[PDB]
Write a protein that binds this ligand. Structure first.
Ligand SMILES: O=C1OCCN1[C@H]1CCN(c2ncnc3[nH]c4cc(F)ccc4c23)C1
Length: 167
């Protein structure tokens, strides 16, 4: 039993809710919140910008030190950093950004990072300003992630479309 509330169950291990991931993280304080990161961990907009703003820029400060030490992530890769006031840990995962021409096949590699964590609160990778089709992202999620994932979808209209079209 866990504290996630109001989720629709899609499969054995995948759950979904129309929610602001920032507000959901603040309320649940999950072990892991996933950030929709880029390779430079520059959290300017979308989910990343919102998560970073909620940490009062502490996420960005920590991220800048990470990059200065380790260099950029790979598209499809991830790193574990602090969850600050939102979660124990933040798993920064880089999905391909279609608006930069990155290969959508890398979306499966991106979701594989979730399997290293038993339970996660996450957005749909490569959705929103990353330019992929969220219906496709949900399908890859369900077909790749085997651990327990609680997906937060900000847009109510999109949430209803994702549920209604789910096979
Ligand atoms: O949700 C969504 O509908 C439309 C597309 N799309 C994607 C992109 C945004 N993303 C999110 N997912 C879950 N929580 C979120 N909180 C946010 C706060 C912000 F300021 C900007 C983006 C998000 C967000 C999924």
């Amino acid at each position: 039993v866990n504290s996630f509330s109001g989720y629709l169950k899609l499969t054995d291990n995948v759950y979904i809710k129309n929610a602001d991931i920032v507000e959901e993280a603040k309320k649940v304080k999950p072990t892991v919140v996933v950030n929709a990161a880029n390779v430079y961990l520059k959290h300017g907009g979308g989910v990343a910008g919102a998560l970073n703003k909620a940490t009062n820029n502490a996420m960005q400060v920590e991220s800048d030190d990470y990059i200065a030490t380790n260099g950029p992530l790979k598209v499809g890769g991830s790193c574990v950093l602090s969850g600050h006031n939102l979660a124990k840990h933040c798993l920064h995962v880089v999905g391909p950004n279609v608006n930069k021409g990155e290969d959508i096949q890398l979306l499966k590699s991106a979701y594989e990072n979730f399997n290293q964590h038993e339970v996660l609160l996450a957005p749909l990778l490569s959705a929103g300003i990353f330019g992929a089709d969220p219906i496709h992202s949900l399908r890859v999620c369900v077909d790749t992630v085997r651990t327990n994932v609680y997906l937060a979808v900000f847009d109510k209209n999109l949430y209803d479309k994702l549920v209604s079209s789910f096979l």
